[PDB]
Design a protein around this ligand. Sequence first.
Ligand SMILES: Nc1ncnc2c1ncn2[C@@H]1O[C@H](COP(=O)(O)OP(=O)(O)O)[C@@H](O)[C@H]1O
Ligand SMILES: Nc1ncnc2c1ncn2[C@@H]1O[C@H](COP(=O)(O)OP(=O)(O)O)[C@@H](O)[C@H]1O
Ligand SMILES: [Mg+2]
Ligand SMILES: [Mg+2]
Lengths: 521, 528
Amino acid sequence: TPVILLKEGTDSSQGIPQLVSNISACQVIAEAVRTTLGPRGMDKLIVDGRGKATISNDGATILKLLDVVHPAAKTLVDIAKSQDAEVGDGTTSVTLLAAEFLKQVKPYVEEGLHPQIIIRAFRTATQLAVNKIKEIAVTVKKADKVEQRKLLEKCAMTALSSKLISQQKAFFAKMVVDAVMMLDDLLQLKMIGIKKVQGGALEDSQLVAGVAFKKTFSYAGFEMQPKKYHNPKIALLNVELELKAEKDNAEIRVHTVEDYQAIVDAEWNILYDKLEKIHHSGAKVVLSKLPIGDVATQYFADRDMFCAGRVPEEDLKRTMMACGGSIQTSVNALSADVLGRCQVFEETQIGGERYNFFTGCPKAKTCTFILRGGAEQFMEETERSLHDAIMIVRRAIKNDSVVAGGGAIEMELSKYLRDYSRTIPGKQQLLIGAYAKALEIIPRQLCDNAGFDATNILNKLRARHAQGGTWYGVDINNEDIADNFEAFVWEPAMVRINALTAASEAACLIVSVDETIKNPR
Amino acid sequence: EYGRPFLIIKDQDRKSRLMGLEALKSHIMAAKAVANTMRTSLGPNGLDKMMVDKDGDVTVTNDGATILSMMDVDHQIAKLMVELSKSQDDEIGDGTTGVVVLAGALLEEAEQLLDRGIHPIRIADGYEQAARVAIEHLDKISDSVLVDIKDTEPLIQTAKTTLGSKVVNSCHRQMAEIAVNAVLTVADMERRDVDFELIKVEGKVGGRLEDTKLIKGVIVDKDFSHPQMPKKVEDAKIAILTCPFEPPKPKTKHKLDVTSVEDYKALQKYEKEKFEEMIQQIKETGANLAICQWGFDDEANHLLLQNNLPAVRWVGGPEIELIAIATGGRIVPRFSELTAEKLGFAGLVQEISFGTTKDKMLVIEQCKNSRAVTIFIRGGNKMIIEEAKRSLHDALCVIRNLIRDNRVVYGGGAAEISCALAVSQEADKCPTLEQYAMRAFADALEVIPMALSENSGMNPIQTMTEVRARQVKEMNPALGIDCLHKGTNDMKQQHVIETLIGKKQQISLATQMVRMILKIDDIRKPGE
Ligand SMILES: Nc1ncnc2c1ncn2[C@@H]1O[C@H](COP(=O)(O)OP(=O)(O)O)[C@@H](O)[C@H]1O
Ligand SMILES: Nc1ncnc2c1ncn2[C@@H]1O[C@H](COP(=O)(O)OP(=O)(O)O)[C@@H](O)[C@H]1O
Ligand SMILES: [Mg+2]
Ligand SMILES: [Mg+2]
C-alpha cells in the first residue's frame, strides 16, 4: 500500500460493465448521422472554435468535425475514412450497419455469452454475405459502347439523389461522365480542376474541355496587349524573365568607367537576348511559374503578344497535358515540338473576376469545372457532391457490375441468412438470426426519414422477397414498394461489399476488448 | 452503472444543440429580422441607414450590399443573408436590397406549411417548380430596346431609373448623361465586354455636387517638378519614361576602384557628362513634356527647366498605363530606345488649383479617340463623395448589362404582379399536394409591391387589389405602383425600366438559397 504499483491517477475498468458501456457509446455516434440518409435526408451545421461554419451532408465529413475522445467510438470514425478512401460512397451506410450489429447482440453479452463465440458468428455470415452479393450481381461483359455511357449515367445520378443538387442531377451527371471518359487510363484526380466563382444561378455551371485559371498579378502595361487569338502557339516556361542579378554568389570588381558602362549594358543585352529568342519561335502566349517583370510585359505589348507570370504549378501541368508541350527551364532549344497549340484563346469576365480560357484542343486529357453558387458554403457543398460522382464512375470503369439499391439488396441478404441459420443447431442459430435482423436497418431508416409507416412497408417487403422479386426496394414518392432495377436505381457492387467487411471488422474488434487502462496526462 | 457520466466529445458540457422543428423555427426568426431591418430602404421614397465603424468612422448609405457588409452579426443564418447580398452585387450590381426582402418573405410563408404537416423537402421542391414557371413567363413580356451610340435616349432612361433611389436624384438627369457616355467610350462592341479598370472614379471635397463632370483624359494628383515651369501647354507631345534621371547602376553587386588622381578625375567627368546626354537624347526626338515614374536629381531638374521642357515626377504605376492608352503613346525603359514614333499626343495639359489649400492637380485633356476616361466627383461633404461614388457605380453596372443583353422589363412592381398571376394560374392544374407550395410562392412574390406602397404612404392591401384586377380585365402587364404620385399607373408612360437579367438573378438566387436554409435540421455551437 505505501508504494503503489502504477502511478496515481490511472483509470482501470473491466468486465461486463465495461463492455456494455462501449456498446451504448457507439449508439451516440450513429445518432449524429442517422437522419442524413435518403432522398429526403437533411444536413447538419457545425461551428468550430474560431466561428467558421460548415454545412455538409457527407457522412465521413461530419464525424471528422466532431471531437470524439471515447476510445471505442473512434473505431466507428476510422471505418468512415476507410469507406471514404476506397470507394468514396457509403460512409453513412457502413456506420449504421456497424451500430446495428452491436445493438442486436447486446442482450447476449448480458447473459454471459463468451465473446469469442460471438466473434466466430460474425465472421461466418460475412463470408456468406459477400459470396451472395457476387453471385447475384448483374453485368454485361459484351462491350456495347452506348450501354456503357448509359450505365455510368445511372450510377452517377443515384449518387447525387441525396445531395443539395438533386434537382439538377440529370444535368450534372452528363457533365461528370464526360469528364472521366477522356482522363487517360490511370485517372489521376489532379487531372480535373474544380474552380469556384461567386454569383450566379446553379444552372450556370459549365465544363471546359481545356484549361482555365484565374488572372494573376500583372505589372504596368498589361492593358495595351490583345486579349484574343485564333491559332496561337503557347510557350510554357519555368524561367524568370526580369532584369536582375545573375548569381547570389557573384561579385564585380572593375577599374575604369569604360568597362563600367560596358557592364551596365551587359545586363540589358542578356535580358533582350532571351526575349528575342522567344519571339522568334512564333509563340504568342507565354506562361511562367516565376515572376515576369514589367520590362518583359511592355516589350511583349509592343509586338501584340500575351504574357502571364506566377502561374500556379498545378494549373501549368494541366495546360501542358491539354495543349501538348513541355516545360522549359532554358530558352536555347525552343523546337517546334515544345510548343502548345490551341484552337482559341480569350479572356472573359466571370462574376467580377477575370479568367483565362484555353479551349478547342482536340487531344485534351483534362477538364475544368466552373461552379456558380451564391455563398462560400454553397459551392463547397457542391464540390463535395461532385467528388462522390467522380469516384463512383472511376470504380465503375474497372468493374461494371451493378445491383439495385433502395433497400432491395439488404432484404435479399437478410432472407438468405434466415434460411441458412435454421439448418445449423446450437447458439449459432440465435447469433446468425440476430445478424440477419441487423441488415434491415437501411430500409427502416429510409422510411423513418421520409415519414411513412415503417412497420407496414417492411412487412410488405419481407413477404415479396420470400414469395419468389429479388430487386424490390422502397418507392419514396409513391410511399410503397417497387422494383428498383427497372426503376433505374443502381450502384456498383463494390460499395456494398466494402460496406460489410469494414462493418464486420469493427464490430468484432470492439466486442473483443476486455479492459481499458488510461494513465495520467 | 448504466448511464454514469461517460465522455464522448471534448468539452461536452460547454456545447449546445438544437434538433427538429425548433431548429427550423429559429432560423426563420433570424432571417425575418434581417429583412425587416432593410424593408424600409426599398423604392424611390426609401430611407437610409447611418453605419458606424469599429474605430468610429461614420458612413451614410442606401446600397443593400454595403449595409449588410458593414453590419457585424453573430447568428450563422444572418451571415448567409450577407453572402447572398454580395453574390448578387458582384454579378449584377443592382438589386441587392430587393433580393433579401424576397428571400425573407419566402421563408416567412413556409412557417405555416411546416406547422400543418408538410415535409420541407416538399416545400423546397415546390418553390423550385414555381420559379421555373415564373422565369419562363418573365421573358415572354420582355421588350428589346436598343444599344447604339446614335440615339442614347433609351440608355439614359434606364440610368435614370436606377439613380432615382439615391441622394444623387437631386441632379440625376446630369449624372445619367455622365454614366452612359463613360461606358460607351470604353465599350468593346465585338467582344461585348467593358473593362472598369479603364474608368477612373476620383472625388475631391469642396465645391458643389453639380460640379461633377466627365473628363475624356487623365487626372493625376501631381504637379510640375520645378516651381518655375509653365503651368500649361497646348500642343503637348508626351514622352513616357520608366527609368530615373540618374547615372546608371547595375543590379548585381559591384565595386569600382579608384587608384589614382587621373582615375578620380575621369570619374568626375563621367558624372556630369551623363547628366547632359539624357536631356539631349530627349530633346532631339521632338518631345515637349517628360513623364517619369521615379525621381530626378537636383542637377537634372534644373537642366530640364533651362531647355524649356516641363516634366512630372513620381507618378504612379496604373496612371502610366492609362496615359499611354489615353494619349496613344508608348512606354520606353531607356533613353537610348526613345524615338519619334513612340511619343503620344495631347491637346491640353494644365495644372488646376483649388481654393485655400495647397492641393494641386494635373489634367490631360483634348486628345484623339481615347479608350480611357475618368469621372470627377465634387461635393460639400465626405459622406456625399462616398455616396456619389457608390451610386454612380450602380449606374455603370446597369448599362453594362444592356451591353450583354438588350431586353428590359418595366419595374415599379408591374413585373412582380404579372409573374405572381402566372404562377397562381399554373397552381390550379397541379393537384399532387404541391399546389399549397405554389400559392405560398405567389403570395411571397407580392411582398415587393407591398414594400413600395407602404413607404409611399398609401394602404398596401387596397392599392395592390385594384392593380391586380386591372391587369386581368385589360391585357396590360405594365401597371405598377404610383410611388411618385403622378396620377397614372402605367409604368411604360412613366418611363420606369429595369433590365431583364436583374430580375432573373433575383428570383433564381433567392429560391436556391431557401433550398439550403430549409434543408438544415441540426446545429452545434460552443457556449460563451
Ligand atoms: N431513387 C432512390 N430510391 C430509393 N433509395 C435511394 C434512391 N437513391 C438513393 N437511395 C438510397 O440512398 C442510400 C445511400 O445514400 P448515400 O448518401 O450515398 O449514403 P452514404 O452517405 O452511405 O454514401 C442508399 O441506401 C439508397 O438506398
Ligand atoms: N419611379 C419609380 N416608381 C416606382 N417604382 C420604382 C421607381 N424607380 C424604382 N422603382 C423600384 O424600386 C425598387 C428598388 O430599387 P432600389 O431601391 O434602387 O434598390 P434595388 O434596386 O437594389 O432593389 C425596384 O424594384 C424598382 O422597381
Ligand atoms: Mg451518395
Ligand atoms: Mg438598388
